[PDB]
Amino acid sequence: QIELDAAYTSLASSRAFLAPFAAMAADMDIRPLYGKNPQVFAGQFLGVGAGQWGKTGADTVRGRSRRVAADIGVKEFQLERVKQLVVDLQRALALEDAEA
Amino acid sequence: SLVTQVILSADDELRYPTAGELETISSYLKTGEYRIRLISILQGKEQEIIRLASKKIFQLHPEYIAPGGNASGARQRALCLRDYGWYLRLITYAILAGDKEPLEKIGIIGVREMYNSLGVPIIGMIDAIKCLKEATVEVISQEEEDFVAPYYDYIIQGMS
Amino acid sequence: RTAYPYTGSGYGSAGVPYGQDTYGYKATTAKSITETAAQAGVFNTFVKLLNESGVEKLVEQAGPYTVFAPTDDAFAALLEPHSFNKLATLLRPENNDALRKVLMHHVIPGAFTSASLMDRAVTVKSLAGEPISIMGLNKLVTAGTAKVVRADVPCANGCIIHAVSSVIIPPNYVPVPQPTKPVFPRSVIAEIAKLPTPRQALGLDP
Amino acid sequence: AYDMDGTGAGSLEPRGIKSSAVEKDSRCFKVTFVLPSQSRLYTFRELQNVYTTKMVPFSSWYAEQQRIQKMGGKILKVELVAGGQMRSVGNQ
Amino acid sequence: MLDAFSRVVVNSDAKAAYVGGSDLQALKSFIADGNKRLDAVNSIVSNASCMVSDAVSGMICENPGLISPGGNCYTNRRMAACLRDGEIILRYVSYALLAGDASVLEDRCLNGLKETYIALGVPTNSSIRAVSIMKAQAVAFITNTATERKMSFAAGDCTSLASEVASYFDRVGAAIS
Amino acid sequence: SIVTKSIVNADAEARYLSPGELDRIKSFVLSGQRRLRIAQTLTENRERIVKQGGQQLFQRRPDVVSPGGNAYGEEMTATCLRDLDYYLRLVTYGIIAGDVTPIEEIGLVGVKEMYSALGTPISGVAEGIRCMKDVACSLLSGEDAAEVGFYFDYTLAAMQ
Amino acid sequence: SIVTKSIVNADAEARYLSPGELDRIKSFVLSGQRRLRIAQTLTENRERIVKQGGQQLFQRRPDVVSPGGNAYGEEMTATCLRDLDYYLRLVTYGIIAGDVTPIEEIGLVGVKEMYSALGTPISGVAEGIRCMKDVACSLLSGEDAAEVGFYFDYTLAAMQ
Amino acid sequence: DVVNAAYPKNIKNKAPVISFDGKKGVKLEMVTLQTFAGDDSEDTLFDYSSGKFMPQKPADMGIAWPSGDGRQAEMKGGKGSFNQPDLRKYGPFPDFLKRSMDL
Amino acid sequence: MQDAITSVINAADVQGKYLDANSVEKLRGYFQTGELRVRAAATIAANAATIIKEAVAKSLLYSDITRPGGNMYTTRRYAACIRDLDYYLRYATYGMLAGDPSILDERVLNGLKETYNSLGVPIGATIQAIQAMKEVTGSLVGSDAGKEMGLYFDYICSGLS
Amino acid sequence: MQDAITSVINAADVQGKYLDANSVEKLRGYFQTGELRVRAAATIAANAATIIKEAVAKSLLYSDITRPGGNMYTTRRYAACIRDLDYYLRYATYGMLAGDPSILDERVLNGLKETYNSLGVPIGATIQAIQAMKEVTGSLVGSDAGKEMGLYFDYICSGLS
Amino acid sequence: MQDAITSVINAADVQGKYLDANSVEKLRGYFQTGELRVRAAATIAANAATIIKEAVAKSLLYSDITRPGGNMYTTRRYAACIRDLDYYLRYATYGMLAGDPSILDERVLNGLKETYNSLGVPIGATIQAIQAMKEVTGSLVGSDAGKEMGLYFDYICSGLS
Numbered sequence A: 001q002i003e004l005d006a007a008y009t010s011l012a013s014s015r016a017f018l019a020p021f022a023a024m025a026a027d028m029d030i031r032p033l034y035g036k037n038p039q040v041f042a043g044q045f046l047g048v049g050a051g052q053w054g055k056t057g058a059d060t061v062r063g064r065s066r067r068v069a070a071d072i073g074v075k076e077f078q079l080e081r082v083k084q085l086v087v088d089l090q091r092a093l094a095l096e097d098a099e100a
Numbered sequence B: 001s002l003v004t005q006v007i008l009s010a011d012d013e014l015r016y017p018t019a020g021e022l023e024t025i026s027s028y029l030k031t032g033e034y035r036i037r038l039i040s041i042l043q044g045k046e047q048e049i050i051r052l053a054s055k056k057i058f059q060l061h062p063e064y065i066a067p068g069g070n071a072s073g074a075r076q077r078a079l080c081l082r083d084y085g086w087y088l089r090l091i092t093y094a095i096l097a098g099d100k101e102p103l104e105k106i107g108i109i110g111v112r113e114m115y116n117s118l119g120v121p122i123i124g125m126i127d128a129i130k131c132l133k134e135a136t137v138e139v140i141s142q143e144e145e146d147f148v149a150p151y152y153d154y155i156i157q158g159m160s
Numbered sequence C: 001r002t003a004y005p006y007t008g009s010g011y012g013s014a015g016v017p018y019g020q021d022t023y024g025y026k027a028t029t030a031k032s033i034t035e036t037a038a039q040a041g042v043f044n045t046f047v048k049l050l051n052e053s054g055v056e057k058l059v060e061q062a063g064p065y066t067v068f069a070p071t072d073d074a075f076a077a078l079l080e081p082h083s084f085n086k087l088a089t090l091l092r093p094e095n096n097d098a099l100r101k102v103l104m105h106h107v108i109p110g111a112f113t114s115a116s117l118m119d120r121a122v123t124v125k126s127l128a129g130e131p132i133s134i135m136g137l138n139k140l141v142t143a144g145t146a147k148v149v150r151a152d153v154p155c156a157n158g159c160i161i162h163a164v165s166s167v168i169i170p171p172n173y174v175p176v177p178q179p180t181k182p183v184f185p186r187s188v189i190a191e192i193a194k195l196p197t198p199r200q201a202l203g204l205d206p
Numbered sequence D: 001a002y003d004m005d006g007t008g009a010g011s012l013e014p015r016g017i018k019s020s021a022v023e024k025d026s027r028c029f030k031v032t033f034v035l036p037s038q039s040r041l042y043t044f045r046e047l048q049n050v051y052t053t054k055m056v057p058f059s060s061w062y063a064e065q066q067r068i069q070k071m072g073g074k075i076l077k078v079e080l081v082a083g084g085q086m087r088s089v090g091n092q
Numbered sequence E: 001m002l003d004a005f006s007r008v009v010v011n012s013d014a015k016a017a018y019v020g021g022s023d024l025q026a027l028k029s030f031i032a033d034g035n036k037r038l039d040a041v042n043s044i045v046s047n048a049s050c051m052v053s054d055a056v057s058g059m060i061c062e063n064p065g066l067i068s069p070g071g072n073c074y075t076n077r078r079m080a081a082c083l084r085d086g087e088i089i090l091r092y093v094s095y096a097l098l099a100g101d102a103s104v105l106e107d108r109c110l111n112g113l114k115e116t117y118i119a120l121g122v123p124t125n126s127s128i129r130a131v132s133i134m135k136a137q138a139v140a141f142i143t144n145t146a147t148e149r150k151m152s153f154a155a156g157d158c159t160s161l162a163s164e165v166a167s168y169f170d171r172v173g174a175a176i177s
Numbered sequence F, G: 001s002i003v004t005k006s007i008v009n010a011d012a013e014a015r016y017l018s019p020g021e022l023d024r025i026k027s028f029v030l031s032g033q034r035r036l037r038i039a040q041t042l043t044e045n046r047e048r049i050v051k052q053g054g055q056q057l058f059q060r061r062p063d064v065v066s067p068g069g070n071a072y073g074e075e076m077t078a079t080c081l082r083d084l085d086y087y088l089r090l091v092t093y094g095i096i097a098g099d100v101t102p103i104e105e106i107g108l109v110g111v112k113e114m115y116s117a118l119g120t121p122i123s124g125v126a127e128g129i130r131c132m133k134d135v136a137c138s139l140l141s142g143e144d145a146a147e148v149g150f151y152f153d154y155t156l157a158a159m160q
Numbered sequence H: 001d002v003v004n005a006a007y008p009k010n011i012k013n014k015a016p017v018i019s020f021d022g023k024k025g026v027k028l029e030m031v032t033l034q035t036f037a038g039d040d041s042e043d044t045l046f047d048y049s050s051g052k053f054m055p056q057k058p059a060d061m062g063i064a065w066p067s068g069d070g071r072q073a074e075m076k077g078g079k080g081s082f083n084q085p086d087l088r089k090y091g092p093f094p095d096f097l098k099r100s101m102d103l
Numbered sequence I, J, K: 001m002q003d004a005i006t007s008v009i010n011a012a013d014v015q016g017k018y019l020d021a022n023s024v025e026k027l028r029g030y031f032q033t034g035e036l037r038v039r040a041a042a043t044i045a046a047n048a049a050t051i052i053k054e055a056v057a058k059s060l061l062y063s064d065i066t067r068p069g070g071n072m073y074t075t076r077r078y079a080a081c082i083r084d085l086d087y088y089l090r091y092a093t094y095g096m097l098a099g100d101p102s103i104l105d106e107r108v109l110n111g112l113k114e115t116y117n118s119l120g121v122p123i124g125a126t127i128q129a130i131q132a133m134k135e136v137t138g139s140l141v142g143s144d145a146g147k148e149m150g151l152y153f154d155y156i157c158s159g160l161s
């Protein structure tokens, strides 16, 4: 638990690292070359091409806050695995209390 | 072995193995057991062959057997068959790892200074290996002895 | 024949080889910080707290450090009635946060041997970030509240290790409070009644 | 200049040792190693001591450490005697 | 005993030197903030009768076995001595802040205090907390961040005198440990 | 080729060629009949392998052909397919030489300097060769597609 | 800085600093008052210098922000401006250090390896710094714009 | 051994704990009263490890490097046909270089 | 620097005996997987830059080693990483072909953890990068080939630890 | 190898923040003494041989290290001294200009006391030579400049001790 | 690298005194044996290969370091021995002429036992080879000349131990 809480403080520190530029690029005019209107040839990027969408969809997004978020999901998997292991250990300790 | 030569030779250029080299590993591994089947044939004929090697190395060179020569005496001749046994054992290694390094990292590199500090005439040892290759042809059929022929004459080329 | 002879060969030589053993540039033999302490058999809680807290990566580095690693009798001496107030809360498993600074106050950038502290009082901040005053007078070298026990231990990267008698707490370190209950106000009318109205602030009402 | 101009694979100068050394780097290691020649028995050159301990620079430690293992050497100990750690500016 | 002027004399006697131009910039900067140092000693000695009761009673509410019978603050004569060495230590630290060097601290206050407190049976770890509350108070008074009495000052940086008085209490707290 | 660098390898080492080197020159020349058939398939399929090669390249990288892309207009798009005809030609050389040595010193050595100096996205031309690879391996059996595709991905590796 | 490499220059040559080196350390420190004013202008103009910097960058390179571009979406565009805030910061270091030594070992050494390994078009980020340069030199007089622009174009040169 | 079929599921009930609450009745209780336990066994019923796991290193082979010269630490298959014995024996060696047979 | 055949020949030679049935039994086991290793080393050579780009973005791309003060901040320091991760993915490819991890400690592992401590490189983040790089390598070469290539990654991670 | 500006930029960069008022406050303090350091380094370059000739004649010229058996007897050994003292007066000049003693331990102090113990060079006489050399350096550059140049001499003497 | 005359001159010079009667007394003792050492170094140069061939055949020729697994098995490893034994018989010849073993530890002994431990060369068999080589050297040069040449062999064996 207390290394999952250290992962959440690193996600909060990674967003404050980029928040002067995340809001500074929020009122720029970023016009692409293709991909939005269908009158321009986009090629592969009409949607996405041939298997490159991923197992989830968030794994194809790059960034400092997406990369520490995948660290959180692998760290919360190991906490939830061992929190469900103390449940059936507590069942067997109470199941052996009905014989004395 | 052969894969080791490709990993090394590709490692000094800081690159993965190219298209041609991966052929050289793939073709070598597909001819795998036939070396394995062949070495078991030769291991069952080591007492076969070294007895035949002592046939002609000494009828060709009675200088070494005679009193005064290096191989004169029982215990000198005793290891004499042992050197054939190690060489024949080395060739089974070379026939398996399909190249010359087990015949070169052992046996060949610095062999002359070994023998010259021993008194064994280095020209006589060349005929000993040539005698050993002459002996391996009889207990081996025509199919597989030219598979093992290039491993012998490398030793003769290494010793000169 | 002079006692302090020298090194070298050829003429103008004193019969002693170069470097006293024929080696000009001697390969070192010390280990690094944390396993020079692991071999000592006295810094057991110190090396273990470093490994758990992640500070041990910092004092792995090659920078010339002057560690003031307390022997575990110092850690065993943390059962003051006083010092247990400000340090017992770190025993909780979520408070690794303060444990790194409190341990990072024991690392000093630089190689300050005790012989280099001949009646000299020089301060410095740690790698924790706050100043510490090293204090060598009357051959009693002090590091905050250290009162160093063993003089120096030569380490790998030109680093030094001094054994201290206690644990140095950083100056502006406040102890973390114990885990508490998030309390909420039961009513809302006991709090509108707790706020002074504008007519109260001008003295118009009692 | 430095060894990271943009060279990588498929570039005109040959693919080689690329060190992360800055402009005129002033960091240097103190290394210790044995490096048997493995080539004297067909060259017959004179013999030289193979156990050396010397200060190699940071600019060329990686090439040297990459090469000491090329010829079967073993590195007994290395340290960063001169230079800082995590230092953005000042390695020059 | 020495001061900050005569510490660099007996350092310059160790090299058989004259006190030349290299060392006088250390001392002319010392008299440059000489008005700052006297503004730091005056914050200590004006609350010094109240800091000693603030610090000894903070030791009691942490380690209450001293006032327990058989303890070391139980007898009322034995309590009045513990208020005395709270302020004799504060008398010798304030001389060390005044002189600028801890020689008079390490030749008169700590000269045998360690074998005193063993032979009186005084608990040494509570003598650390009697000293170190006065460390945390004097760095609050000199930085003027004491939370219930602010003194008037010409404004500016003072953090070197704060760490200097924190360095003198650690030489007390290490010499009696 | 495998013949020329198996020589220059043993050339530098002051020695002849081992059985490991001469049983592969032997193994390569018996492979030569099958190599010319594979290169013969790609030789007169360049109309489809290139034109369908640039098919998927634009449908995957519309930026390079869109206005502002390097291969924009009737002109650059023709040269946009010209380079693919080059690299498809070099793969036919590598298949017959049994190595990327022809592809090495033509189209690979210093390729990043050219395309960086032409303003062309080098990653874009790497995408073009991958699109040609799926068209090429779709024209051959599995035993051949492990070769013809094998030389493309080496070109993909060196081109980034 | 000019102080540290004028030292390490004369350090390597086993000598002290010449008048040519010491009349410029002297000339640089008297220049230090004017340098802090110039860096002080860029320090609290990063809101406009960066945001208008990415203004012209997207108008000149819509591919990088269009769908498929490296800086596409709300996420990458924020990091798209983050790097410009980095390089604008390093130029403030170079102005105060009187040299691109801070910009050299931060953001320039091995920069092509990073951006090639991130998939970012290195030419695109070079276009971004040029757009910041016109905004920066528009904030200062002619005597200053010959400096603040002077450090940007060095970053432009090393970034391609 | 589990030989306690004399002791059922009703071992540690501790029937005689008795609380008088004054001069009235004895108020008999069967509270189980566990120990200051801890049940000292290793490798329990589940894994309890979610990632953060590359701890495995080979054992030290002395002066050579680990797992390199295991040509002395193997079994064998054969020995050869002639094989003159040693007669000087000079101690068994620690693997007789960091170089292998195939140097 | 020994492959599976070199290690088998060495152990059979170090006792002075011929290649018996047990020595050839392992050699036949290596030749059976000879077809799998080349195709594994084939695709890894193709997607070398793509694998390293996937590992760093999945393990340590946005962590605060990437930010200022972290161990990977400056562009020289970032560029050293992908140079550094290239060796792990490359030398692991050599171990996968040779079938013996002797080349790793010969040319990678020795003086490695002693070098990162000198530079102050975080060994913790390094292993997780290799673990993430091992995870993507199992994507390309398949399951069993990933088991083979993965068997040398953790060998690096174990000794580097 | 950092000057005062490099050290200020490093500490302000290592936290990822800009150059605030405190970082520029020290930088302004360094630029104020920029005029003093050059003139200090000016005269020291002129009187380099004269300063070293004054120090050795004032500290260790006639002591019995100079006589037979002493550590400085032979002409090679005497000539090594003034070569050796030249570095201390030279590198101290670099620290006086850079305003940071990082260059000393980077290029002088590391492996220095460990080297003199190998040769058997007396560290006691060495420091007194540098102390006497510090005394004459305060003669030339003045009082405060001598305080600056003197601040790096004892830094050498401290670490060399 | 000092001979008997160099060592005598050094000790007489290191006290700054002339060559008195005691210093010349040893020098006359060295010149008396000057005729013996050259003839000793004469025959050793002639029978260099014969002496080394006699030592290895008498000490470690048939021991199991010579057999597989032993420290001397491969031909490169065997050839390194007689190359290695040549230095001991050669440098001992230099010490016999110079009359001072300073050249041995200067050029042979330093880093030698630390090198054999690295390679894993058995120091026990090495000394017995030199002892056997010392035994044959007393055969050629005679008794007293063998006492002289033998006096530097065990000096190598002592320090190499």
Ligand SMILES: C=CC1=C(C)[C@@H](Cc2[nH]c(/C=C3N=C(/C=C4\NC(=O)[C@H](C)[C@H]4CC)C(C)=C\3CCC(=O)O)c(CCC(=O)O)c2C)NC1=O
Binding pocket: C088, C089, C090, C092, C177, C178, C179
């Ligand atoms: C920072 C240092 C630190 C400590 C000193 C302890 C202090 C402490 N103890 C408890 C909490 C508790 N403390 C006790 C202990 C006792 N109750 C008794 O009647 C006995 C006399 C005595 C034991 C000898 C009990 C029984 C609980 C309830 C929770 C539990 O049993 O686990 C709590 C949780 C508060 C709450 O939720 O109510 C805290 C902070 N924990 C810390 O983290």
Ligand SMILES: C=CC1=C(C)[C@@H](Cc2[nH]c(/C=C3N=C(/C=C4\NC(=O)[C@H](C)[C@H]4CC)C(C)=C\3CCC(=O)O)c(CCC(=O)O)c2C)NC1=O
Binding pocket: E056, E066, E072, E073, E077, E078, E079, E081, E082, E083, E084, E085, E086, E088, E089, E108, E109, E113, E116, E120, E122, E123, E126, E127, E130
């Ligand atoms: C010049 C140096 C100098 C000092 C530093 C002080 C300290 C000091 N205190 C006492 C004497 C004492 N000192 C203490 C003090 C304490 N016990 C505690 O539990 C607390 C931790 C601490 C108070 C803060 C007590 C309790 C006595 C009384 C012993 C007694 O009366 O028998 C004595 C012995 C004097 C005597 O009783 O005859 C001295 C030397 N006085 C000095 O002259």
Ligand SMILES: C=CC1=C(C)[C@@H](Cc2[nH]c(/C=C3N=C(/C=C4\NC(=O)[C@H](C)[C@H]4CC)C(C)=C\3CCC(=O)O)c(CCC(=O)O)c2C)NC1=O
Binding pocket: E047, E050, E051, E053, E054, E055, E057, E058, E059, E060, E061, E062, E133, E136, E137, E140, E141, E145, E146, E147, E148, E149
């Ligand atoms: C259980 C009993 C108990 C106490 C009595 C207080 C005692 C106390 N006060 C302070 C801390 C302090 N104590 C004082 C002392 C004083 N303030 C003044 O203005 C006067 C001069 C003097 C009282 C006469 C000062 C000035 C500080 C610093 C902060 C401040 O109060 O402004 C500290 C150190 C910090 C800490 O550990 O919390 C302690 C232990 N705390 C306790 O836990």
Ligand SMILES: C=CC1=C(C)[C@@H](Cc2[nH]c(/C=C3N=C(/C=C4\NC(=O)[C@H](C)[C@H]4CC)C(C)=C\3CCC(=O)O)c(CCC(=O)O)c2C)NC1=O
Binding pocket: H020, H022, H023, H024, H025
């Ligand atoms: C409700 C629960 C309950 C109890 C716990 C006992 C308690 C108890 N015991 C006695 C009364 C007594 N208790 C004792 C017992 C003893 N006296 C001794 O001196 C011995 C040390 C000890 C023997 C072990 C004796 C001897 C008497 C008096 C004779 C008797 O009443 O039996 C009385 C009556 C006292 C009176 O008359 O006021 C009571 C209430 N009885 C109860 O009804």
Ligand SMILES: CCC1=C(C)/C(=C/C2=NC(=C\c3[nH]c(/C=C4\NC(=O)[C@H](C)[C@H]4CC)c(C)c3CCC(=O)O)/C(CCC(=O)O)=C2C)NC1=O
Binding pocket: A061, A062, A063, A064, G064, G065, G069, G070, G071, G072, G076, G077, G079, G080, G081, G083, G084, G086, G087, G106, G107, G108, G118, G120, G121, G124, G125, G128, I057, I061, I062, I066, I067, I073, I074, I075, I078
């Ligand atoms: C101080 C020197 C320095 C630089 C420059 C630097 C760059 C840097 N740029 C990054 C990402 C990135 N950079 C971009 C940049 C761009 N996209 C575009 O279209 C434009 C052409 C361009 C910006 C003008 C994008 C899109 C990412 C995220 C890529 C991804 O998520 O895969 C990352 C990874 C995430 C992070 O940690 O921030 C680093 C480290 N680090 C440094 O230390």
Ligand SMILES: CCC1=C(C)/C(=C/C2=NC(=C\c3[nH]c(/C=C4\NC(=O)[C@H](C)[C@H]4CC)c(C)c3CCC(=O)O)/C(CCC(=O)O)=C2C)NC1=O
Binding pocket: B057, B064, B065, B070, B071, B072, B076, B077, B079, B080, B081, B083, B084, B086, B087, B106, B107, B118, B119, B120, B124, B125, B128, K057, K061, K062, K066, K072, K073, K074, K075
């Ligand atoms: C693995 C490679 C390898 C080889 C070959 C090897 C050889 C070797 N041959 C030796 C001796 C000898 N070898 C011979 C050999 C011969 N006389 C003849 O007429 C023949 C042509 C020839 C044998 C076929 C003789 C006579 C001696 C004894 C010489 C003596 O000691 O007087 C010795 C000295 C000890 C011993 O006999 O074991 C070695 C080490 N060592 C090795 O490691």
Ligand SMILES: CCC1=C(C)/C(=C/C2=NC(=C\c3[nH]c(/C=C4\NC(=O)[C@H](C)[C@H]4CC)c(C)c3CCC(=O)O)/C(CCC(=O)O)=C2C)NC1=O
Binding pocket: D018, D019, D020, D021, D058, D061, D062, D065, D066, D085, D086, I065, I071, I072, I076, I077, I078, I080, I081, I082, I084, I085, I087, I107, I108, I109, I112, I115, I119, I121, I122, I123, I125, I126, I129
């Ligand atoms: C072939 C076996 C082998 C390896 C592995 C090797 C590593 C090696 N890594 C180095 C640096 C480095 N390595 C890193 C790596 C990292 N930073 C992080 O945060 C990550 C955890 C990690 C990437 C996975 C960095 C940042 C440097 C530069 C350190 C500096 O400039 O101080 C250096 C210093 C010289 C240079 O890069 O030119 C060497 C020699 N050398 C070898 O011969």
Ligand SMILES: CCC1=C(C)/C(=C/C2=NC(=C\c3[nH]c(/C=C4\NC(=O)[C@H](C)[C@H]4CC)c(C)c3CCC(=O)O)/C(CCC(=O)O)=C2C)NC1=O
Binding pocket: F064, F065, F069, F070, F071, F072, F076, F077, F079, F080, F081, F083, F084, F086, F087, F106, F107, F108, F118, F120, F121, F124, F125, F128
């Ligand atoms: C045999 C090895 C080999 C190659 C590869 C080669 C390439 C090459 N490509 C060129 C141009 C070009 N190449 C492109 C290519 C592209 N535009 C895109 O959008 C795509 C990403 C990409 C093609 C798939 C364009 C647009 C030009 C013209 C650039 C200009 O006109 O400025 C030119 C200059 C004109 C010419 O002489 O053809 C050469 C020499 N030469 C060689 O000898």
Ligand SMILES: CCC1=C(C)/C(=C/C2=NC(=C\c3[nH]c(/C=C4\NC(=O)[C@H](C)[C@H]4CC)c(C)c3CCC(=O)O)/C(CCC(=O)O)=C2C)NC1=O
Binding pocket: D036, D037, D038, D040, D047, D048, D049, D050, H096, H097, H098, H099, H103, K065, K071, K072, K076, K077, K078, K080, K081, K082, K084, K085, K087, K107, K108, K109, K112, K115, K119, K121, K122, K123, K125, K126, K129
């Ligand atoms: C001039 C002073 C001096 C000496 C003495 C010296 C020794 C030295 N002996 C070496 C190897 C060796 N030395 C031996 C020696 C022996 N094996 C045995 O069983 C015997 C006990 C012993 C013969 C007496 C062997 C077998 C090797 C090769 C080790 C290997 O390939 O791993 C090597 C490694 C490189 C090489 O030979 O090219 C050096 C440097 N170098 C010097 O500069």
